[PDB]
Short mmCIF file of C-alpha atoms in Angstrom, two decimals:
data_model
loop_
_atom_site.label_atom_id
_atom_site.label_comp_id
_atom_site.label_asym_id
_atom_site.label_seq_id
_atom_site.Cartn_x
_atom_site.Cartn_y
_atom_site.Cartn_z
CA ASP A 1 -32.68 30.24 -45.65
CA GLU A 2 -34.60 31.44 -42.59
CA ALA A 3 -32.03 30.11 -40.67
CA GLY A 4 -29.19 31.68 -43.10
CA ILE A 5 -31.02 34.84 -43.04
CA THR A 6 -31.80 35.00 -39.35
CA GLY A 7 -28.84 36.93 -37.62
CA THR A 8 -26.83 39.72 -36.68
CA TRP A 9 -25.39 41.38 -39.98
CA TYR A 10 -23.29 44.22 -40.34
CA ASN A 11 -22.61 46.64 -43.49
CA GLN A 12 -19.92 47.90 -44.81
CA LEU A 13 -20.18 51.19 -42.88
CA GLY A 14 -20.46 49.20 -39.52
CA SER A 15 -24.56 49.35 -39.16
CA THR A 16 -26.07 46.53 -37.44
CA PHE A 17 -29.18 44.68 -38.83
CA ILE A 18 -30.25 42.12 -36.17
CA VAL A 19 -33.05 39.84 -38.14
CA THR A 20 -35.37 36.88 -37.97
CA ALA A 21 -36.64 35.58 -41.26
CA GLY A 22 -40.44 33.85 -40.01
CA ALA A 23 -41.68 30.71 -42.52
CA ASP A 24 -44.19 33.06 -44.21
CA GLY A 25 -41.64 35.31 -45.92
CA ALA A 26 -41.64 37.85 -43.30
CA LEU A 27 -38.56 39.52 -42.00
CA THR A 28 -38.72 41.33 -38.20
CA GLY A 29 -35.89 43.22 -36.23
CA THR A 30 -34.18 46.18 -35.97
CA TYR A 31 -31.51 48.20 -37.47
CA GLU A 32 -28.99 50.63 -35.97
CA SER A 33 -27.55 53.16 -38.40
CA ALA A 34 -23.27 54.34 -38.11
CA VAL A 35 -24.30 57.41 -39.73
CA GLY A 36 -26.50 59.81 -40.35
CA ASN A 37 -29.44 61.53 -38.35
CA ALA A 38 -29.72 58.38 -36.47
CA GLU A 39 -29.59 57.16 -32.86
CA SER A 40 -29.95 53.60 -31.35
CA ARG A 41 -31.87 51.13 -32.68
CA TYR A 42 -35.43 51.03 -35.41
CA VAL A 43 -38.12 48.89 -36.09
CA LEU A 44 -37.69 47.48 -39.52
CA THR A 45 -40.35 45.09 -41.47
CA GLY A 46 -40.27 42.93 -44.22
CA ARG A 47 -40.32 40.64 -46.81
CA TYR A 48 -37.92 37.16 -48.45
CA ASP A 49 -38.37 34.46 -50.93
CA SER A 50 -39.10 31.48 -48.80
CA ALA A 51 -39.25 29.68 -51.45
CA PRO A 52 -36.18 30.46 -54.06
CA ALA A 53 -34.84 28.73 -57.01
CA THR A 54 -32.31 25.84 -56.44
CA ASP A 55 -30.42 26.96 -59.78
CA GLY A 56 -27.61 28.64 -57.51
CA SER A 57 -30.37 32.32 -57.71
CA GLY A 58 -29.61 34.39 -54.62
CA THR A 59 -32.67 34.40 -52.21
CA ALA A 60 -34.56 38.06 -52.96
CA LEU A 61 -35.81 40.77 -50.39
CA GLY A 62 -36.38 43.48 -49.11
CA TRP A 63 -37.10 45.74 -45.99
CA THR A 64 -37.87 49.17 -44.47
CA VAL A 65 -36.47 51.42 -41.89
CA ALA A 66 -38.30 54.34 -40.75
CA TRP A 67 -36.29 56.53 -38.91
CA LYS A 68 -38.14 57.27 -36.08
CA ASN A 69 -37.39 55.85 -32.49
CA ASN A 70 -37.76 56.93 -29.29
CA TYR A 71 -34.54 59.18 -29.12
CA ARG A 72 -34.69 60.85 -32.72
CA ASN A 73 -37.09 60.98 -36.11
CA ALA A 74 -35.23 62.22 -38.94
CA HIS A 75 -38.43 62.20 -40.67
CA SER A 76 -37.20 59.89 -43.47
CA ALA A 77 -37.42 55.79 -44.83
CA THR A 78 -34.61 53.49 -46.55
CA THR A 79 -35.68 50.93 -47.99
CA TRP A 80 -33.35 47.95 -49.21
CA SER A 81 -33.77 46.02 -51.80
CA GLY A 82 -31.52 42.84 -52.67
CA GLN A 83 -30.72 38.99 -52.34
CA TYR A 84 -28.87 36.72 -49.87
CA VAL A 85 -26.15 34.22 -50.91
CA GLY A 86 -25.76 31.49 -48.57
CA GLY A 87 -22.07 29.17 -48.37
CA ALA A 88 -19.06 29.98 -47.85
CA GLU A 89 -18.87 33.78 -46.50
CA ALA A 90 -22.85 34.48 -46.83
CA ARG A 91 -23.78 38.39 -47.80
CA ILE A 92 -27.10 40.00 -48.46
CA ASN A 93 -25.95 42.28 -51.33
CA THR A 94 -28.77 45.59 -51.44
CA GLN A 95 -29.57 48.50 -53.35
CA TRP A 96 -31.52 51.12 -50.82
CA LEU A 97 -33.69 54.10 -51.40
CA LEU A 98 -33.67 56.53 -48.35
CA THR A 99 -36.49 59.45 -49.12
CA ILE A 100 -36.74 62.49 -47.20
CA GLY A 101 -40.23 64.32 -46.47
CA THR A 102 -40.25 67.10 -48.08
CA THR A 103 -42.05 70.45 -49.59
CA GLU A 104 -43.15 69.70 -53.57
CA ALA A 105 -40.64 72.42 -54.39
CA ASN A 106 -38.23 70.26 -52.85
CA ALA A 107 -39.20 67.18 -54.00
CA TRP A 108 -36.50 66.32 -56.75
CA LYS A 109 -34.19 66.21 -54.25
CA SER A 110 -35.92 63.81 -51.69
CA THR A 111 -34.43 60.87 -52.34
CA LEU A 112 -30.77 59.32 -52.20
CA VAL A 113 -29.93 55.91 -53.72
CA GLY A 114 -26.91 53.16 -52.01
CA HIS A 115 -25.05 50.07 -51.85
CA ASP A 116 -24.91 48.08 -48.79
CA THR A 117 -23.24 44.71 -48.45
CA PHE A 118 -23.77 42.86 -45.06
CA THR A 119 -22.53 40.22 -43.72
CA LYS A 120 -21.71 37.96 -40.18
CA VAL A 121 -18.83 39.80 -39.52
CA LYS A 122 -18.29 43.12 -38.71
CA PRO A 123 -15.30 44.96 -40.05
CA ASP B 1 -51.98 60.54 -41.40
CA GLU B 2 -53.13 57.19 -39.87
CA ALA B 3 -56.20 57.75 -41.40
CA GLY B 4 -54.57 59.76 -44.39
CA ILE B 5 -52.39 56.64 -45.53
CA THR B 6 -54.74 54.37 -44.38
CA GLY B 7 -57.05 52.50 -47.32
CA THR B 8 -56.96 51.79 -51.16
CA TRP B 9 -54.68 53.18 -53.70
CA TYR B 10 -54.03 53.22 -57.56
CA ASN B 11 -50.94 53.74 -59.27
CA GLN B 12 -50.62 54.75 -63.00
CA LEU B 13 -50.18 51.03 -64.25
CA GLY B 14 -53.39 50.13 -62.84
CA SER B 15 -51.95 48.00 -59.87
CA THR B 16 -53.49 48.17 -56.49
CA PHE B 17 -52.24 48.82 -53.08
CA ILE B 18 -54.34 48.07 -49.88
CA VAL B 19 -52.86 49.40 -46.56
CA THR B 20 -53.21 49.76 -42.88
CA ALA B 21 -51.05 52.50 -41.22
CA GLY B 22 -50.66 51.30 -37.44
CA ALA B 23 -50.54 54.06 -34.58
CA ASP B 24 -46.77 52.46 -34.18
CA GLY B 25 -45.63 53.13 -37.50
CA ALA B 26 -46.29 50.16 -39.03
CA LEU B 27 -47.71 49.50 -42.68
CA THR B 28 -49.34 45.98 -43.71
CA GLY B 29 -51.87 45.11 -46.57
CA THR B 30 -51.35 43.77 -50.07
CA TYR B 31 -50.54 44.97 -53.45
CA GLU B 32 -51.64 43.95 -56.88
CA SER B 33 -49.47 44.41 -59.43
CA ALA B 34 -51.08 44.78 -63.07
CA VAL B 35 -48.04 44.07 -64.88
CA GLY B 36 -45.03 41.46 -64.81
CA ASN B 37 -45.05 37.97 -63.85
CA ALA B 38 -47.59 38.26 -61.04
CA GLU B 39 -51.32 37.61 -60.17
CA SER B 40 -53.72 38.34 -57.19
CA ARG B 41 -52.80 39.75 -54.50
CA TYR B 42 -49.54 39.71 -52.41
CA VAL B 43 -48.24 40.61 -48.55
CA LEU B 44 -46.84 44.13 -48.14
CA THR B 45 -45.11 45.24 -44.98
CA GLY B 46 -43.21 48.30 -44.35
CA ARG B 47 -42.97 51.85 -42.23
CA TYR B 48 -43.90 54.85 -41.86
CA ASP B 49 -43.14 58.13 -40.30
CA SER B 50 -45.71 58.57 -37.49
CA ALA B 51 -44.91 62.12 -36.10
CA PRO B 52 -43.86 63.85 -39.70
CA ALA B 53 -43.26 67.38 -40.13
CA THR B 54 -45.54 70.35 -39.58
CA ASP B 55 -43.73 72.51 -42.30
CA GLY B 56 -45.87 71.23 -45.27
CA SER B 57 -43.54 68.55 -45.67
CA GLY B 58 -44.79 64.97 -46.90
CA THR B 59 -44.47 61.89 -44.73
CA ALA B 60 -42.35 59.52 -45.93
CA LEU B 61 -42.73 55.65 -46.06
CA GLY B 62 -41.98 52.71 -47.63
CA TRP B 63 -42.65 48.78 -47.81
CA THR B 64 -41.48 45.64 -49.28
CA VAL B 65 -43.57 42.98 -51.65
CA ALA B 66 -41.70 39.95 -52.03
CA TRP B 67 -43.43 38.06 -55.33
CA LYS B 68 -44.03 34.85 -53.82
CA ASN B 69 -48.39 33.90 -53.05
CA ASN B 70 -50.47 30.85 -53.33
CA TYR B 71 -50.33 31.25 -57.37
CA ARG B 72 -46.88 32.14 -58.45
CA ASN B 73 -43.68 32.57 -57.62
CA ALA B 74 -41.19 35.22 -59.64
CA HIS B 75 -38.17 34.86 -56.94
CA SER B 76 -37.87 38.63 -56.64
CA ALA B 77 -38.99 41.38 -54.25
CA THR B 78 -40.19 44.99 -54.63
CA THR B 79 -39.22 48.15 -52.50
CA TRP B 80 -40.88 51.31 -52.73
CA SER B 81 -39.78 54.79 -50.75
CA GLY B 82 -41.39 57.51 -50.77
CA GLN B 83 -43.35 59.88 -49.35
CA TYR B 84 -47.16 60.80 -48.84
CA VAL B 85 -48.10 64.47 -49.91
CA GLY B 86 -51.95 64.90 -48.05
CA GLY B 87 -55.02 67.70 -49.68
CA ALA B 88 -57.45 67.48 -51.74
CA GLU B 89 -55.69 65.21 -54.68
CA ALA B 90 -53.77 63.22 -52.07
CA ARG B 91 -50.97 61.16 -53.28
CA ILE B 92 -48.10 58.72 -52.35
CA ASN B 93 -44.51 59.38 -54.28
CA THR B 94 -42.20 56.60 -54.84
CA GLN B 95 -39.30 55.33 -56.14
CA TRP B 96 -38.89 51.30 -56.40
CA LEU B 97 -36.13 48.49 -56.93
CA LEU B 98 -37.39 45.43 -57.49
CA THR B 99 -34.57 42.59 -57.49
CA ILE B 100 -34.42 39.66 -59.10
CA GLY B 101 -32.72 36.29 -57.40
CA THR B 102 -29.48 36.07 -59.73
CA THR B 103 -26.67 33.91 -60.18
CA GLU B 104 -23.18 35.76 -58.83
CA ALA B 105 -22.51 36.18 -62.65
CA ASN B 106 -25.76 37.79 -63.66
CA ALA B 107 -25.95 40.18 -60.52
CA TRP B 108 -25.03 43.38 -62.49
CA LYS B 109 -28.10 42.84 -63.69
CA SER B 110 -30.74 41.82 -60.93
CA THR B 111 -31.80 45.08 -60.17
CA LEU B 112 -34.51 47.30 -61.80
CA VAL B 113 -35.41 51.01 -60.83
CA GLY B 114 -38.65 52.96 -61.62
CA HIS B 115 -41.01 55.35 -60.10
CA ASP B 116 -44.75 54.75 -59.23
CA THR B 117 -47.47 57.34 -58.02
CA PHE B 118 -50.64 56.34 -56.32
CA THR B 119 -53.67 58.24 -56.00
CA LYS B 120 -56.49 57.71 -54.09
CA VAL B 121 -58.90 57.89 -57.28
CA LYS B 122 -57.98 56.03 -60.09
CA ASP C 1 -7.27 66.07 -61.45
CA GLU C 2 -7.39 65.98 -65.66
CA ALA C 3 -4.52 64.29 -65.11
CA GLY C 4 -5.60 61.73 -62.24
CA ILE C 5 -8.99 60.98 -64.35
CA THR C 6 -6.80 60.41 -67.57
CA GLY C 7 -5.89 56.90 -68.58
CA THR C 8 -7.06 52.91 -67.95
CA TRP C 9 -9.52 52.19 -65.30
CA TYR C 10 -10.96 48.58 -64.64
CA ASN C 11 -13.82 48.11 -62.34
CA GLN C 12 -14.64 44.74 -60.40
CA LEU C 13 -16.35 42.99 -63.40
CA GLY C 14 -13.38 43.07 -65.57
CA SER C 15 -14.88 46.02 -67.49
CA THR C 16 -11.98 48.43 -69.17
CA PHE C 17 -12.62 51.98 -69.32
CA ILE C 18 -10.23 54.34 -71.18
CA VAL C 19 -10.59 57.63 -71.03
CA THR C 20 -9.20 61.39 -71.29
CA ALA C 21 -10.11 64.25 -69.03
CA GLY C 22 -9.32 67.70 -71.01
CA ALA C 23 -9.18 71.02 -69.05
CA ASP C 24 -12.70 72.25 -69.86
CA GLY C 25 -14.29 69.48 -68.25
CA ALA C 26 -14.92 66.60 -71.06
CA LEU C 27 -14.32 63.15 -70.97
CA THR C 28 -13.46 61.13 -74.57
CA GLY C 29 -12.74 57.33 -74.95
CA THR C 30 -14.16 53.71 -75.46
CA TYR C 31 -15.42 51.30 -72.49
CA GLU C 32 -15.61 47.96 -72.90
CA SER C 33 -17.83 45.59 -70.93
CA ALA C 34 -16.62 42.45 -69.89
CA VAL C 35 -20.74 41.33 -69.38
CA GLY C 36 -23.59 41.82 -71.44
CA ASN C 37 -24.74 42.42 -74.94
CA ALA C 38 -21.29 43.96 -75.85
CA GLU C 39 -18.56 43.23 -78.23
CA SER C 40 -15.20 45.22 -78.79
CA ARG C 41 -14.69 49.09 -77.23
CA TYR C 42 -17.93 51.66 -77.34
CA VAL C 43 -17.44 55.55 -77.45
CA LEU C 44 -18.27 57.15 -74.41
CA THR C 45 -18.68 60.81 -73.29
CA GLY C 46 -19.17 62.53 -70.19
CA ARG C 47 -17.70 66.09 -67.90
CA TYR C 48 -16.53 66.48 -64.47
CA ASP C 49 -15.90 69.17 -62.23
CA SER C 50 -12.66 70.49 -63.65
CA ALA C 51 -12.13 72.60 -60.44
CA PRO C 52 -13.14 70.79 -57.56
CA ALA C 53 -13.37 71.41 -53.73
CA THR C 54 -9.86 71.06 -51.81
CA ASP C 55 -11.53 69.71 -48.26
CA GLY C 56 -10.36 66.84 -49.52
CA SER C 57 -14.42 66.00 -51.44
CA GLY C 58 -13.88 63.75 -54.67
CA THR C 59 -14.16 65.19 -58.16
CA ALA C 60 -17.75 64.79 -59.78
CA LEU C 61 -18.20 62.85 -62.80
CA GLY C 62 -20.17 61.15 -65.15
CA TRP C 63 -20.19 59.32 -68.32
CA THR C 64 -22.63 57.39 -71.08
CA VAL C 65 -22.17 54.44 -73.63
CA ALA C 66 -24.66 54.26 -75.89
CA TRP C 67 -24.53 50.45 -77.00
CA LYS C 68 -24.05 49.98 -80.37
CA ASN C 69 -20.72 49.86 -82.67
CA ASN C 70 -19.73 48.45 -85.39
CA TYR C 71 -20.17 44.88 -83.75
CA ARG C 72 -23.62 44.92 -82.05
CA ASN C 73 -26.12 47.19 -81.07
CA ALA C 74 -27.99 45.69 -78.10
CA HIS C 75 -30.54 49.08 -78.28
CA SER C 76 -29.71 50.18 -74.66
CA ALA C 77 -27.58 52.87 -72.93
CA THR C 78 -26.01 53.75 -69.44
CA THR C 79 -25.04 56.61 -67.82
CA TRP C 80 -22.63 56.11 -65.05
CA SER C 81 -22.58 59.16 -62.00
CA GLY C 82 -20.09 59.20 -60.08
CA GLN C 83 -16.71 60.39 -57.69
CA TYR C 84 -12.91 60.78 -58.57
CA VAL C 85 -11.10 60.14 -55.20
CA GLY C 86 -7.22 60.55 -55.43
CA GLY C 87 -4.27 59.29 -53.86
CA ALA C 88 -2.29 55.86 -52.97
CA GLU C 89 -5.18 53.75 -54.46
CA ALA C 90 -7.06 56.23 -56.63
CA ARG C 91 -11.28 54.85 -57.19
CA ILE C 92 -13.88 55.81 -58.93
CA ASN C 93 -16.85 54.98 -57.72
CA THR C 94 -20.13 55.09 -59.18
CA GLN C 95 -23.67 54.48 -59.69
CA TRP C 96 -25.46 53.63 -62.80
CA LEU C 97 -28.23 53.30 -65.05
CA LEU C 98 -28.85 51.00 -68.04
CA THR C 99 -32.07 51.95 -70.14
CA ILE C 100 -33.04 49.28 -72.85
CA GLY C 101 -35.39 50.72 -75.23
CA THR C 102 -39.20 49.56 -74.78
CA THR C 103 -42.10 49.71 -76.15
CA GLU C 104 -44.81 51.85 -73.98
CA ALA C 105 -46.22 48.76 -72.22
CA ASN C 106 -42.82 47.63 -70.72
CA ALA C 107 -41.67 50.97 -69.77
CA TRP C 108 -41.55 49.89 -66.07
CA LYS C 109 -38.75 47.32 -66.72
CA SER C 110 -36.72 49.33 -69.17
CA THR C 111 -34.41 50.13 -66.35
CA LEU C 112 -31.26 48.51 -64.55
CA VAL C 113 -29.49 50.46 -61.69
CA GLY C 114 -26.41 48.73 -60.33
CA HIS C 115 -22.58 50.31 -58.95
CA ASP C 116 -19.23 50.14 -60.19
CA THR C 117 -15.92 50.85 -58.63
CA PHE C 118 -13.12 50.85 -61.06
CA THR C 119 -8.96 51.02 -59.85
CA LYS C 120 -5.94 51.83 -62.43
CA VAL C 121 -4.78 48.13 -61.57
CA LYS C 122 -6.90 44.33 -62.71
CA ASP D 1 -34.56 60.34 -84.84
CA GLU D 2 -31.72 62.81 -85.62
CA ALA D 3 -34.41 65.40 -86.66
CA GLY D 4 -36.85 64.15 -83.60
CA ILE D 5 -34.36 64.34 -80.87
CA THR D 6 -32.49 67.41 -82.15
CA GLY D 7 -34.34 71.10 -80.56
CA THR D 8 -35.40 72.06 -77.28
CA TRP D 9 -36.79 69.99 -74.28
CA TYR D 10 -38.47 70.97 -71.28
CA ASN D 11 -39.38 69.20 -68.44
CA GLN D 12 -41.66 69.35 -65.54
CA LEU D 13 -39.51 71.25 -63.16
CA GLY D 14 -38.88 74.03 -66.36
CA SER D 15 -35.13 72.75 -66.71
CA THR D 16 -34.54 73.68 -70.70
CA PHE D 17 -32.73 70.83 -72.48
CA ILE D 18 -31.31 72.60 -76.05
CA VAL D 19 -29.48 69.36 -78.32
CA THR D 20 -27.85 68.16 -80.72
CA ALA D 21 -28.39 64.63 -82.23
CA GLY D 22 -25.20 63.66 -84.87
CA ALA D 23 -25.42 61.03 -86.89
CA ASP D 24 -23.02 59.15 -85.42
CA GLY D 25 -25.15 58.66 -82.49
CA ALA D 26 -23.41 62.52 -80.39
CA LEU D 27 -25.20 64.05 -78.09
CA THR D 28 -24.29 67.65 -77.56
CA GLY D 29 -25.69 70.56 -76.25
CA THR D 30 -27.19 72.68 -73.11
CA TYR D 31 -29.14 72.32 -70.33
CA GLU D 32 -30.28 75.20 -68.02
CA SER D 33 -31.66 74.05 -64.70
CA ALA D 34 -34.29 75.95 -62.65
CA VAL D 35 -33.85 74.04 -59.62
CA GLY D 36 -30.67 73.74 -57.54
CA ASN D 37 -26.80 75.47 -57.55
CA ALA D 38 -27.00 75.90 -60.95
CA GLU D 39 -27.25 79.79 -63.33
CA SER D 40 -27.61 80.06 -66.57
CA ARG D 41 -26.50 76.96 -68.93
CA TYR D 42 -24.06 74.12 -68.63
CA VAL D 43 -22.74 71.92 -71.67
CA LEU D 44 -23.40 68.82 -71.94
CA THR D 45 -22.92 65.33 -73.63
CA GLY D 46 -24.53 62.23 -74.01
CA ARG D 47 -25.45 59.28 -76.61
CA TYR D 48 -28.01 58.10 -77.85
CA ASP D 49 -28.97 54.81 -80.58
CA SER D 50 -28.59 56.31 -83.85
CA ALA D 51 -29.79 52.24 -85.33
CA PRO D 52 -32.74 51.75 -83.18
CA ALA D 53 -35.30 48.49 -83.51
CA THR D 54 -38.00 48.90 -85.72
CA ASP D 55 -40.48 47.49 -83.70
CA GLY D 56 -42.21 50.27 -81.32
CA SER D 57 -39.36 50.82 -78.78
CA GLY D 58 -38.34 53.61 -77.59
CA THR D 59 -34.96 54.98 -78.18
CA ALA D 60 -32.17 54.38 -75.82
CA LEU D 61 -30.11 57.89 -74.74
CA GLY D 62 -28.05 59.29 -72.13
CA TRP D 63 -26.48 62.53 -71.42
CA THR D 64 -23.62 63.96 -68.68
CA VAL D 65 -24.19 67.62 -66.61
CA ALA D 66 -21.34 68.74 -64.61
CA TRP D 67 -22.18 71.99 -62.87
CA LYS D 68 -19.92 73.92 -63.58
CA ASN D 69 -20.19 77.25 -65.80
CA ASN D 70 -18.42 80.40 -65.96
CA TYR D 71 -20.53 81.80 -63.46
CA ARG D 72 -20.80 78.46 -60.63
CA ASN D 73 -19.19 75.46 -59.62
CA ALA D 74 -21.62 73.29 -57.61
CA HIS D 75 -19.00 70.83 -57.56
CA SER D 76 -21.50 67.81 -59.04
CA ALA D 77 -23.25 66.48 -62.16
CA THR D 78 -26.16 64.66 -63.30
CA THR D 79 -26.28 61.77 -65.62
CA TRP D 80 -29.91 61.30 -67.47
CA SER D 81 -30.84 57.47 -68.96
CA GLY D 82 -33.74 56.98 -71.34
CA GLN D 83 -35.71 56.73 -73.55
CA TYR D 84 -37.01 58.64 -76.84
CA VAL D 85 -40.41 58.74 -77.77
CA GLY D 86 -41.20 60.00 -81.10
CA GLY D 87 -44.68 61.32 -82.58
CA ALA D 88 -46.96 64.17 -82.52
CA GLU D 89 -46.45 64.74 -78.28
CA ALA D 90 -42.50 63.11 -78.35
CA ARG D 91 -40.89 62.76 -75.46
CA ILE D 92 -37.96 61.68 -73.29
CA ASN D 93 -38.57 59.54 -70.52
CA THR D 94 -35.27 59.54 -68.18
CA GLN D 95 -33.97 58.53 -64.77
CA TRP D 96 -31.42 60.40 -63.19
CA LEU D 97 -28.14 59.94 -60.79
CA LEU D 98 -26.91 63.23 -59.28
CA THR D 99 -23.22 62.94 -57.19
CA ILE D 100 -22.16 65.41 -55.51
CA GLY D 101 -18.60 65.80 -54.83
CA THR D 102 -18.18 64.25 -50.49
CA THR D 103 -15.44 62.88 -48.50
CA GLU D 104 -15.04 59.17 -48.39
CA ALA D 105 -16.86 59.29 -45.22
CA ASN D 106 -19.99 61.21 -46.41
CA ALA D 107 -19.90 59.40 -49.92
CA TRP D 108 -23.33 57.24 -48.33
CA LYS D 109 -25.00 60.23 -48.99
CA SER D 110 -23.41 61.74 -52.04
CA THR D 111 -25.78 60.54 -54.83
CA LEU D 112 -29.52 61.48 -55.39
CA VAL D 113 -31.98 59.39 -57.58
CA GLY D 114 -34.98 61.22 -59.58
CA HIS D 115 -36.60 61.18 -62.71
CA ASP D 116 -37.19 63.42 -65.56
CA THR D 117 -39.84 63.84 -68.26
CA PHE D 118 -39.09 66.09 -71.41
CA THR D 119 -41.52 67.34 -74.01
CA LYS D 120 -41.35 69.81 -76.69
CA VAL D 121 -43.85 72.30 -75.31
CA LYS D 122 -43.25 74.49 -71.57
CA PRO D 123 -45.64 72.41 -68.76
#
């Protein structure tokens, strides 16, 4: 699913995820958030299962964005963990954790959790 | 804190995280898991904030391991999201998500959540 | 929102959530899951914000089911944390944590995470 | 485990959880948070597995606090999901979700995630 995963994806917020899957399990590309303390594109890197099960299971993957580029530094990072489901209406279904750099005193409110669904159609 | 993050880290479960932090915000390295359908080292990649706040805040970072190597394939991937906190007893405090490739029917039970704390001494 | 929350709700999986919101902030009722190791209705209890904000914000709430009843015991419990959003197509949008009783050795794989959206129809 | 769970628990933050485990699987009591937009005690309700496994497994449980009492209203709720481990140093190991009421546009940033360990002794 290297070619299936490679492409331009959008989530339900209208964020843009441009990714290349390599033969070796690498994900590389750019992420542009339509919300939050974010402007323009950010580097992403991650991993996917390059030899997945043949039983109709999805392809396990994940990636990270640290929210620093030449325009903005939000002192935060998001990881997405999910699976690619090919076929009719290909979608990447994810859960994510967004951690913000905090003091020790504030560490209890440092991490947001959510869920993003990506498809190749911009909504 | 490129130097602060670069090196060898251990979690509460006896897993080993070996990481280099690049100047550009890259993380790259290897993870060895002491539990689950894992054996030997796995490639990790991630990102960190290479210019953090200067108010005592931690440094945000994250990484991914897909649980495939030359020996095993667990058809799953973990992401760690967290922050590095420097000082005499340096720590990386994380939460993680572990997704297993599932059918659409079983997707509701595809993702585990937990927390790992990494220190520079076991 | 006592009135808007009280009633029968359905999620995307086919599960049924039957709840009463008290004036005091209580949620009480029964949950019927369409998946997993579950049969018939389970007791649920939770709390909601009985005096929400009036700026168009949702109403925070949460509840717990322990997966024991007179048919099954799956030795597990789920909590849903979310918000009620009123209007034409009312919705309760939630994330959930499902913990299974484990030995200390298996506690890293004790907790699933997911998300459920509940509507008044389906 | 009714006797084991019933009582006062303290987390790493110094918050105080006072709970009664009913014979039927009910949890009722009060929560006082040492952090956040919290003052004094708040009602909690939850459930636990009242017929657990006898293989050395923990006892699954969960509870909810809505952060409104007579004194304050933070327009939020937390749920804790976890398990009770009995013994001389008994523990409740939890993960929690804290949801704040938001507009639909800000719903992506409505939910914090964390972990609390509760013991019988002040930390």
